[PDB]
Design a protein around this ligand. Sequence first.
Ligand SMILES: Nc1ncnc2c1ncn2[C@@H]1O[C@H](COP(=O)(O)OP(=O)(O)OP(=O)(O)O)[C@@H](O)[C@H]1O
Ligand SMILES: Nc1ncnc2c1ncn2[C@@H]1O[C@H](COP(=O)(O)OP(=O)(O)O)[C@@H](O)[C@H]1O
Ligand SMILES: Nc1ncnc2c1ncn2[C@@H]1O[C@H](COP(=O)(O)OP(=O)(O)O)[C@@H](O)[C@H]1O
Ligand SMILES: [Mg+2]
Ligand SMILES: [Mg+2]
Ligand SMILES: [Mg+2]
Lengths: 143, 821, 194, 97, 676
Amino acid sequence: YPFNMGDLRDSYLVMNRYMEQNQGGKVPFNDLIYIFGEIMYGGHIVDDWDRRLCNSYLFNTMHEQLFDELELFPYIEGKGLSFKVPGQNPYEKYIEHIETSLKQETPLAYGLHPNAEIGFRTDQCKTLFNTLLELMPKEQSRD
Amino acid sequence: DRVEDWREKLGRVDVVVNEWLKVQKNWKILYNIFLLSEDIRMQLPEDTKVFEGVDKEFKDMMSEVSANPSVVEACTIERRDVLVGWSQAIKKCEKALNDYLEQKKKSFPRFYFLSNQSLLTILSNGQNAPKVCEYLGDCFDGLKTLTFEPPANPAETSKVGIGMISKDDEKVPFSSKFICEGAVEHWLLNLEFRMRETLQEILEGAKNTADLWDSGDKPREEWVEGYNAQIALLTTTIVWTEDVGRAFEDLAGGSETAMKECQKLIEVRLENLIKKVRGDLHILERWKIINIITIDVHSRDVVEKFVIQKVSEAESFAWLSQLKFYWENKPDSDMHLRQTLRFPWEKDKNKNKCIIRIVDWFRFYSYEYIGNAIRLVITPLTDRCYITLTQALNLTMGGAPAGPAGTGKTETTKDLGRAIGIPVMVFNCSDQMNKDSMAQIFMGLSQSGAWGCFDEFNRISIEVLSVVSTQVKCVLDALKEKKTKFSFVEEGEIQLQDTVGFFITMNPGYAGRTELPENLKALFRSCAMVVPDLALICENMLMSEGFTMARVLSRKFVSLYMLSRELLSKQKHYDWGLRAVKSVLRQAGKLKRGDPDMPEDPLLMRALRDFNMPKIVTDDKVIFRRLIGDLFPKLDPPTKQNPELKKIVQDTTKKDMGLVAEELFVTKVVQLAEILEVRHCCFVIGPPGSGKTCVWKTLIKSYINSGEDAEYDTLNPKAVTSDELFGAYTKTKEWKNGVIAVIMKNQVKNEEKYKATHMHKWSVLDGDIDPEWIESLNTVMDDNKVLTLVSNDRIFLTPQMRLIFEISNLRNATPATVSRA
Amino acid sequence: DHMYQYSLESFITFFFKAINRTTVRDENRIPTLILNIRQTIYQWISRGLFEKHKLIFLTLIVFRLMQKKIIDVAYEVAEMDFLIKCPARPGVENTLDWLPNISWDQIQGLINLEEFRNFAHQLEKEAPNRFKDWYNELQPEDQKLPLDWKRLDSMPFKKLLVLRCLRPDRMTISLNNFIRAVLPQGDAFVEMDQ
Amino acid sequence: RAVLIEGIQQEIDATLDPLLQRAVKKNGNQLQLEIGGDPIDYDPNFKLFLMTKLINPHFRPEIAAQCTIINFIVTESGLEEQFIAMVVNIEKNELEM
Amino acid sequence: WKGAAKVKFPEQGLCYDYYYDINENKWNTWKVEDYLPNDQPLFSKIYVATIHTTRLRYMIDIHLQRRKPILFIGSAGTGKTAVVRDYLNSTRPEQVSHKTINFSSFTDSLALQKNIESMVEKKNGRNYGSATNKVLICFIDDFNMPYVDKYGTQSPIQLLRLILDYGSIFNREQLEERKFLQDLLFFGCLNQKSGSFTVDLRLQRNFSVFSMYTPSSDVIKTIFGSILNAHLSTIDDKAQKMAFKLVEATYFTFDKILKNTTAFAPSAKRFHYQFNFRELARVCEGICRTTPGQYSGGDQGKLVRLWAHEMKRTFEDRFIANEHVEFFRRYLTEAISKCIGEFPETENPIAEPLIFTGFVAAHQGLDQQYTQCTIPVLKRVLDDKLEEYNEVKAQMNLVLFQQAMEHVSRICRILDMPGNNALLVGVGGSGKQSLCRLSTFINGFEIDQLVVTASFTINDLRNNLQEIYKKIAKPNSIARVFMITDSQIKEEQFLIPINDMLNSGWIFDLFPKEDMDSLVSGVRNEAKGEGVDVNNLTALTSYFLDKIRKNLKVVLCFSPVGDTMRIRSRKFPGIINNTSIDWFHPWPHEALIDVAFRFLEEIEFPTEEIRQSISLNMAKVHSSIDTANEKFLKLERRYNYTTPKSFLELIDFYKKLLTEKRETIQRQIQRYEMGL
Ligand SMILES: Nc1ncnc2c1ncn2[C@@H]1O[C@H](COP(=O)(O)OP(=O)(O)OP(=O)(O)O)[C@@H](O)[C@H]1O
Ligand SMILES: Nc1ncnc2c1ncn2[C@@H]1O[C@H](COP(=O)(O)OP(=O)(O)O)[C@@H](O)[C@H]1O
Ligand SMILES: Nc1ncnc2c1ncn2[C@@H]1O[C@H](COP(=O)(O)OP(=O)(O)O)[C@@H](O)[C@H]1O
Ligand SMILES: [Mg+2]
Ligand SMILES: [Mg+2]
Ligand SMILES: [Mg+2]
């Protein structure tokens, strides 16, 4: 699916327009996940299994506890990555907080298992030796 | 030096020869625009007198060269420079018109959607009003022509307009006389407003009498008869939004029944309206009532979904999401900020205005007459496709519905706009679209608050597509700033009406695709379009044909045809698609209208079985009969046998044919007669050696022995060539009458197949159906009883005339060709 | 992949550029000229290549040097063919708890190579004691097979063969490690423009 | 002077078949060969190069005898043998002049 | 079907070989009329009744007494056409009117309608039959052949299914007029394994289908036995007992070819390897040429050679691969060890230099012989006759090496056999065209080749063909040959006329029916002289067609490259089956050394030992390319090809380059010797 910065920008402009109308009243997360999930990442998704996934992410992150520090990483019970939504601080702090999240890339960030990475590395190795086979010149030039 | 002098002479000839062809062609056009247009003549008196001084010259200079015919004698550097003199002056009197046409497009901005030829014609016949009205069918969604008061002097065409006529000939009368003033672009802009005023004026009268058909003597069904299709739908949806609003206010009080009573009342009106489409009605007042069915069936499905999910609060998303239609004079009107006020009722703030709300996009109803165009079935997908597009128009960017061809991306964008009221224009982008051609579209779209759907926009040259972006950006960038007057790229200062939208209907996996530059995709909020759920379309088609329990039956129906595809022996002559559904529902509908008291389940069961059996082969008869017996468990089907025709077929087969009248044989003759009575075009297919000819020949010899002389002209279509069959022009431009086509003319009247008393004539075409051959006949194969030829001579097929195709195998046949017959 | 098309005329300029950037004056020129030409042409192509194709193109080079025997590497014609495409022969249901069926199906392909003919019966001689312990460990390309298959580690291409068959995840790192050892200034080829 | 015919992948056009025949008919002093419908005069010192941008072409044996096939294909040791002369001109430019 | 309830069959016979006689009530076996020898010069007119041919003759009479159309389906060369072409000939001319329509692939629904409209007269109203209620037979041969369009529906076939069912052909000019057809029958002759293997079951229904079985060991012995026993009763009282011995063999060999399918089967590359009656006919034709004087006496050896040869040169000729030529000669020297059973000596009657020719006797001054010459006698006569063709016609210089010597020998044989049309397949440059022109001049015949311009039309071909058919049709006519090549056929349409010429007599509708009423009239003064019946106008038209067939030979000259011959063979049945194929192999090593040496003559050489020696290396080079060309196709995919024209253009170039080079020196040396 083609996801673009315009798709994030779009969903910010709608979020802005919905947080300017509520003000002191409680935010409408349930209203705001549909427009985020089903509309801005409707356009791309037709499969209806990817659609169920696309929303589940969004249901997980977006609720009342988000404004309090909340583990953005899905079901990290006792793994220890624990990348939270920063509390009230100056703007500059937010960019530093993203550099403070561990440099190590894990699939565990996305809710997948570590052993999902092991499969990707195998698929990476497979796609090398399918491209090498295509370009392997002259078939050894006989003997 | 003899040669190079001769080369210079040919070099001189080639310039002056091309200069007449440049002038003559450009003159011929500009001449025709001035010729027979005293209207256009008096408008530009400076560039018309100049032109008359260039035509009168040209005719004299042409008759002075006629003496010296040869190019060598005719060609002079004197002649050349004079013709360059005209190219320069005819360029000025074509720039004069082009700059004048732009003035009249800018004055009345629907003209931008007319072909420049049609605009020149309307402007030429500004006095002759009824010729102008003819071309407003191109401009508008409905309003094909106007009605008129027969005038004082019969030589004069009538100015005074007493009503408007739709493209299906539904009349909407005007409150008083609408006169056609001097200028064309002036009385048209006066008309464009009056359209919306009457529509608006009638809606006040509708919503007053709409609150009255709750309690008052006049029911809902008898009330719908009085008003237009557009206004009788809007008023139905306005009193639904009211009802569900009163149901939420009650359910805040604590009354649990409120949302169940709301559900009950919606489902009774829907049932009571299905009993109206069953009883014999006028074809205009079918759709005025069936468009109300397809909205009411959705109304029900929403209030069900509220009762199941137990949503007991208004301003929950569930209710915001749904497309609502209010009828309030908001004393705290936020509408002047949300959009711009255009119309006088919108600005009045004393009289009640129709407002349309959906997920924080509230925009007044822009009353553009539609004229009983068929509303699509409202699916769970289309509900979302409204949220997407509305959110896009509120976020001041275009909306890009995208999915496989046949989904109806273009149709769902049109229907949203038609619901909102707004005029939706459609463009068939063919990769011949220049910068200028597209620039004119957007300028006219921008000025006249309209919605540009672009059917197959995906095939626009990536060159011109990179401009489209620069033009679309410039308009959208203006809408964000909310500028009334905005600068376009060329012809800067132009009016912008706030309600403009853009929609690019892109077939994502279509061949010859120009991938949109990332720039352009970032202006167009995409939508995911799936082939509409077969269940929902059948559930409509069932309610169209007088079935009260349609919902349940329609789930049984989708199940049958879906499983049938999987577990029967795949044949080419089987059609389990939606096309074959409609036919079996039509034949079930004629059997409902015959006997309404019978339960709906045994009647559908009978119809489904009765028509799918003669399609189905021996192997599949035993499994299919079981498959129906699964879906309809305990229903015992009685075989509906024609008792009179079966006797007269048995008698003919023995007496005047000689063949043995087997019980299974006459069952096939009865099964052909029933197919021919509803379907003009039949396929008596089978294995090579079987009773295919003998079955249709015995039917004829009963129609002779019961009704009147059934004539038949048996041609083998594949035997003769496709050119010789239909007929085509010789080397000399003289159109030869071909075999099928001359039979089709000879049968209408004057031959042996003529119409004196012949109750059923039919031509039998006993060759193998191939795509190239049948393609020319595809017009008649469809619902239209109309045959087109190479000479453009039409042969309108009579309703008492059939096409019987006797085919062994449908191996080369297209899946559509099978469905048609 | 489209738009990796390189002219002979453009290549010739980078081939000559490389000859004119050599500072070595006839001492060990012919050796140091070859090296400079490989790096020069390699970087020229890589800059153009996407992330995913950069590793593929570098392996083609070291396998085409191997194929033409410009650098000495312990490889057999059949062995390189097996590495580039693993035929997975089913038939032997006998497995270990730790080994996937796919890994095993590849080993029955590997046993057709005359070097690894006895490698199966070996894998059922001290199966959990040696190979499970090896297969489990993180970074097994630098670890050694303690049933005296040590010798494979001492020949970097034959060991690279085994790793694909048993533990393919690590291949893309093992190959990167192999490039560096076998190829002259390999460490400079793999790092490139970091 | 000369004509190079580009494309001409395989199946040589029927109009060339009379030209491809090296035979030229001698009409007294002036030589005239019959190409196409109408015969035209043919002057001496005329060349006709045919070139085929085609990896592994296939010609009718009849045509292969009628026109001499000449394969300019830079492959394997080909370039190698060009690059030596190239390099030896650049490196050891002394004792190449 | 020997599960047949009450009326049991007699044993020792198939159910086919028994009809139920009412007067005996037995199941008598079909009785076959023993062949009486006629004097038909065309072998195609000879018809020996077999068991199968009588029990079909009945079944055709049973489907003509009724209006039930018949279809015969059998392998390409089974003799279906002959069975029907006998019946139609034996019909009464007042009851039946017979006309053949030989389908060509290009026979469209228009072309059939013109043929049917020409046959049928105009009754009263819109009806069209024969006046006097005759039965108008329209015999379709090669029913399958019509062009199968992309979809799978043959237009002419679909027309017939409009004529059989409703009987109403829409008039292709004025497409409103129904035009009902009456009293037509259609006699099909479909062969499986050619064109559209099967036709639409929607027609085959309307027809009664009758298999025609591949040649049996008995059916061959009752036909070709009866032809020779008859034709050796003539030659000698002895050398009859050799007839059955040779006919036993010609089968035995014919069988061991069909049973070894992996060697000799009809394939895409072996499309002409079709071995059926056609070959046994023109073996039994080539033995029927033995004149009593030059064969009478002890025939133990002389016959069996004449056989071996006639066999050899209608099978070897056919074969492409030299493995297949070796396989054949093993069968042929098994056949002679069993059937002819003499194995006369250690020297086999079969040998390398076995050449039989009827022109070598003529030239000397001996009368209508077809006896064997030796190679050195054939070398004198041919060389003398090439001198005689250079002297009178346009000069053609060729070498005459043993293999080209053999080629004239076995083309002069195929022209001499009346009716039999030649088909010389070989790579362009083989000199098939040049050797034919010689072969033609050897015999007293006059070659007529059409001269194609760049802009040529079907109508201009049909005036060139119509010019030839004005020369044959005069009585005292020297039989004109018709030379065609691959280059001459610019488009595939031109072949259509040609396939109808070589299939039988003359191409249907190349004249008006007023011109053909005058051409018939010019051959009424010849028929009285022959003693054939006059003012019958059925036998006279027939007798003329036999004279046109006899005085027209059609030699077409193709190349087997890129399957352009194969697609022609597929489209036109005539080309391959109706003509006696003779394949042009690349020149042997022994030949090349001769060919080179003739051209190296009139060049100087120090000790003349060089000139022989060069001509060895000129052969070796051309033989050493063909062994590299094979290495080049096996090693890489790259295709190269060499032709005998390629070699002949080397010898030219060397001669030209050697003179130039030597003339540059002989000038240079002269300056120095002048100066010294
Ligand atoms: N009910 C019947 N009683 C007697 N004879 C019949 C009956 N039905 C068919 N026949 C006979 O069997 C044949 C049926 O073939 P028919 O005439 O129907 O052509 P068809 O098979 O439909 O055509 P096609 O082969 O082109 O598809 C005819 O000979 C007809 O007389
Ligand atoms: N009984 C026979 N007597 C003489 N010649 C026969 C006989 N049967 C078949 N032939 C010959 O066999 C050859 C091939 O058979 P033909 O009749 O052309 O039909 P088809 O193409 O169906 O084989 C012909 O030359 C024909 O004369
Ligand atoms: N035996 C031979 N000796 C010398 N030249 C020969 C011989 N056979 C053929 N040629 C030459 O080869 C040429 C082939 O051309 P052509 O006669 O048109 O035959 P083809 O049908 O093969 O094209 C002949 O014209 C002749 O000049
Ligand atoms: Mg029929
Ligand atoms: Mg035949
Ligand atoms: Mg030739």
